[PDB]
Amino acid sequence: QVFQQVNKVLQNDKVLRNLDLGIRTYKVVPLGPKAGIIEFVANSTSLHQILSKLHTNDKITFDQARKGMKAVQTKSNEERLKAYLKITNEIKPQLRNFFFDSFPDPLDWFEAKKTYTKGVAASSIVGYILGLGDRHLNNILLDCSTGEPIHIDLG
Amino acid sequence: QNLTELFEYCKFDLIMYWFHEFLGRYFVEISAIYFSQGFNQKWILDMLHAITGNGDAYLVDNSYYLCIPLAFISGGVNELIFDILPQISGKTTVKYHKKYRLLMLKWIIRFTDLGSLTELRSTVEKLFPTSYLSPYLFENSSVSMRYQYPLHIPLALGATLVQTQFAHEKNNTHEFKLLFLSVITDLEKTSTYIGKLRCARELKYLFVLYENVLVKSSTLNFIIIRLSKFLIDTQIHDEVITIFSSLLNLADKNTFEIEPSLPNLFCKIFIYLRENKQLSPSFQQAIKLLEHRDLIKIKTWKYCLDAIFGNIVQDDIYENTELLDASDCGVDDVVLVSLLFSYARRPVASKIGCSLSKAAAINILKHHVPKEYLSKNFKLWFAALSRRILQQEHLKNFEMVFRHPEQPHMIYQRISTFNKEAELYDSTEVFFISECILTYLVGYSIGNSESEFCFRDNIMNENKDKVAPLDKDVLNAIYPLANNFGMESFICDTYLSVNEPYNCWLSKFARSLIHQISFNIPPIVCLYPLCKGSTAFCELVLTDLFFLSTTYDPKSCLNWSNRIFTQIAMLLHVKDSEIKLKMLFNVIKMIRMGSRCKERNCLRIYSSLDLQEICQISLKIKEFKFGYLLFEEMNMPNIREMNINTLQKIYECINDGDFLAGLPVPHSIEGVLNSINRIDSDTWKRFLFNNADFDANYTTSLEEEKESLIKATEDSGFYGLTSLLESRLSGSSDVYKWNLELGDWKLLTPKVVDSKAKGLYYAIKNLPQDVGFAEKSLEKSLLTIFDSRQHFISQTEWMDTLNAIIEFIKIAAIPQDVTSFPQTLMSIMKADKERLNTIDFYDHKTTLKSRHTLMNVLSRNSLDENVKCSKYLRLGSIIQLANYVQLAIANG
Secondary structure (H helix, E strand, O other): HHHHHHHOOOOOOOOOOOHOOHHHHHHOOOOOOOOOOOOOOOOOOOOHHHHHHHHHOOOOHHHHHHHHHHHHOOOOOOOHHHHHHHHOOOOOOHHHHHHHOOOOOOOHHHHHHHHHHHHHHHHHHHHHOOOOOOOOOEEEEEEOOOOOEEEEEOO | OOOOOOOOOOOHHHHHHHOOOOOOOOOOHHHHHHHHEEEEEEOHHHHHHHHHOOHHHHHHHHHHHOHHHHHHOOOHHHHHHHHHHOOOOHHHHHHHOOOOOOHHHHHHHHOOOOOOHHHHHHHHOOOOOOOOHHHHHHHHOOOOOOHHHHHOOHHHHHOOOOHHHHHHHHOOOOOOHHHHHHHHHHHHOOOOHHHHHHHHHHHHHHHHOOOOOOOOOHHHHHHHOOOOOOOOOHHHHHHHHHHHHHHHHHOOOOOOOOOOOOHHHHHHHHHHHOOOOOOOHHHHHHHHHHHHHHOOHHHHHHHHHHHHHHHOOOOOOOOOOOOOOOOOOOOOHHHHHHHHHOOOOOOOOOOOOOOOHHHHHHHHHHOOOOOOOOOOOOHHHHOOOOHEEEHHHHHHHHHHOOOOOOOOOHHHHHHHHHHHOOOOOOOHHHHHHHHHHHHHHHHHHHHOOOOOOOOOHHHHOOOHHHHHHHOOOOOHHHHHHHOOOOOOOHHHHHOOOHHHHHOOOOOOOHHOOOOHHHHHHHHHHHHHHHHHHHHOOOOHHHHHHHHHOOOOOOHHHHHHHHHHHOOOOOOOHHHHOOOOOOOHHHHHHHHHHHHHHHHHHOOOOOOOOHHHHOOOOHHHHHHHHHOOOOHHHHOOOOOOOOOOHHHHHHOOOOOOOHHHHHHOOOOOOOOOOHHHOOOOOOOOOOOOOHHHHHHHHHHOOOOOOOHHHHHHHHOOOOOOOOOOOOOOOOOOOOOOHHHOOOOOOOOOOOOOOOOOHHHHHHHHHOOOOOOHHHHHHHHHHHHHHHHHHHHOOOHHHHHHHHHHHHHHHOOOOOOOOOOHHHHHHHHHHHHHHHOOOOOOOOOOHHHHHHHHHHHHHHHHHHHOOOHHHHHHHHHHHHHHHHHHHHHHHOOO
């Protein structure tokens, strides 16, 4: 409900409305103690799944999860040198392939990229002002088609 | 025939006709038929040709001659010998296998008898004048019977006379499909060459109609529209007579309730009447009587009929407020609308209203620009509604194709949509060629079938259900297809593959004039020729047949993809695609292929060809002709810390996406950053830097364009410091804006293609006289600007400009009866407030100031010729200025 009211004031300013900059919302009325709402977004999946496929045969997936666990109780910081920055060498980023292999139509590809980037800037700032956390990859949802990243319910 | 009837090295005549043995080979089929026809005149010279022949020595007579052997007449006895079929499968061989021979015979038999005689032949041949036949007979009866007996020429036709009716009688089981194909075959042949023998076509068409009982109501709409020729007054007279009969026939049948024929009737009638303001009275009744059929929307058609006959009137609606009947589909039916507006009717005035956009808006701007010759009234109507129009605002197939194995059938789906619609009849042979191909193909696919051969797929897709509706009958016969076109033969052998590398796909400076109009076709033919080596039945032939067709380009993407199923990977052009200094479009075509050739590697069905492709390099060409794909072509090979300043060029190629700001600018030179600060967006610091540099070095370094400063200076709100920075100096080209903003004027007239402010400037600056007739002069400026709009210096702005010109009128149009004047002002102010809801208060400023300015000019030119209105003009100017300020502070 708050986000919709935020979107309301990212408008009526001439400059952002003219740049198609804003944020995606829901409606999501809960029903009772279990609720469950609706509004599954069409033509979208999850950022997690996209990445799992892109990185499916490059180095090791679960091992990254293990290093992020094993180091939790180690001394001080340290782990960043000992492992995080070593793991970092991994395979280098692959997300760009999502778009290149999905939209081989240069004019549309180009517009989707602009959409994608603007949609991150608006995400970051509003989330920052609100002071939102979690996300944890799974609450990050990337639409295809236009490429606009959206959030799903955040706590 | 003249050479055949000789025995003294008669063939030697060919030496001149050719301007060797090849001269006879060139029409060998005709010669074979001629020998058979010669019959009594057959001789050793014919035997010599038979000796030259192989299987054909017997087989051509047994097959090729049959295509038109009957057309030669050569006595009933000769026909009987052919029927004897000494070397062929009896009657089936020259009947079932040659229904199309009827057309060849019909042409040979085309007596083109004077109507007085033709009518008698018809009395026997089309006995009883059965309704539509009576109407057709009536059309024949309207003739002056000015036929030349001499038209017979070689005159098998004269002999055919009405005797031909008995020959026609040899036929059986007449069907729609036969009529359908015959009409288009002849229609296209008769659409070309000299009009000298046009009468023969008319007679042939009448005979075709007389012979056919097939009149399945709405089914006949295609006839009406395909025959809409009237290319010449002589042709038009014949066409009108036939058309009158056709309209009468629809009425005679009390059916054929066809509405979507009418826009292709009236566009042509009304075009015909331009200059040639005459029309047959039998036609006039044939069409006027349709008024009461009431099978149509009527209102739009009612106006068309009154426009033709009398009292066009309809100022109340047809003149402007009538619904856009064309706000559906039809593309060029808008021609009728535009014409009707120009015809009679009235000047567009007093707002009109007509709040319709949607489809109308789409169609107006869809195919756009059909008005090669239409103007008056319509241009004003259009411009008046411009605001309302403005207020209105492939990979899936590729992916499927690349998801398939050797499944060329996808081409048939492309072919079907193409001939079904595409131009929706542009009055060309293309329709005919495509229909013929489709007919052959379907007959194969659900006929011999057996192997899918990708043909049967049409049935699997149910494409065949529609395609066969008027086809897949009395055809097949690749040999007949070979008569329809000489293609599906040597052309493929000649096109080859290496030959393209050596010509069509060679630098080929000589082909520079061929380009997309022909070099591309040659390359496509070669692709087909190579594919043909292991191609499916029908498909090889179809590709060759269409080779001479126009704009069939997409077929090549598919064909190329399929021919590269081969392990050979010749590629060739791919390896040296950069030398492109002869013509443009072959470049663009190669780029399109380069894109789809990449897409397949995201499926990774076969990528060795992409890997072997030269990276970058050709990229510079892609840059010169500027695709946006350059970001992919450049970024994907890079994705690292490496720069390369071609990057700057790419961003410059798009002006700016607010991307240039991210370039790795931090220079080692203090002050060189001014080169960046001056490029984008900033409204103040960039001013200071440009001024600082000027003072720092202008000394003697006066060569620096002052434009970086002039730009900053004007955007910052100065005018008083800009006219004096770059006065008579080179610097920009939009100076009129400054003189417009100020009261300076005095920059002559921008007759040399105006844009935006220049148009506004033009309209006021060149407007003489204190009101009075000055308004008409102002209207003339609107028309002038519209024509500049047709240049189209830029997109959209011109529509806005027309609106703005319209804004000057109306208010400037009413010094007369200055009562309602205050409401005019209120209306325009409110409209402006809405306009400003979108688009920043920047470019719009000139419109607002210009409106102010015109009111001041009119109030200044006036004194006392005028009574009272100058008071209203001066006041209007002051009030508007107040509103200018209010909008400016609100958004500016």
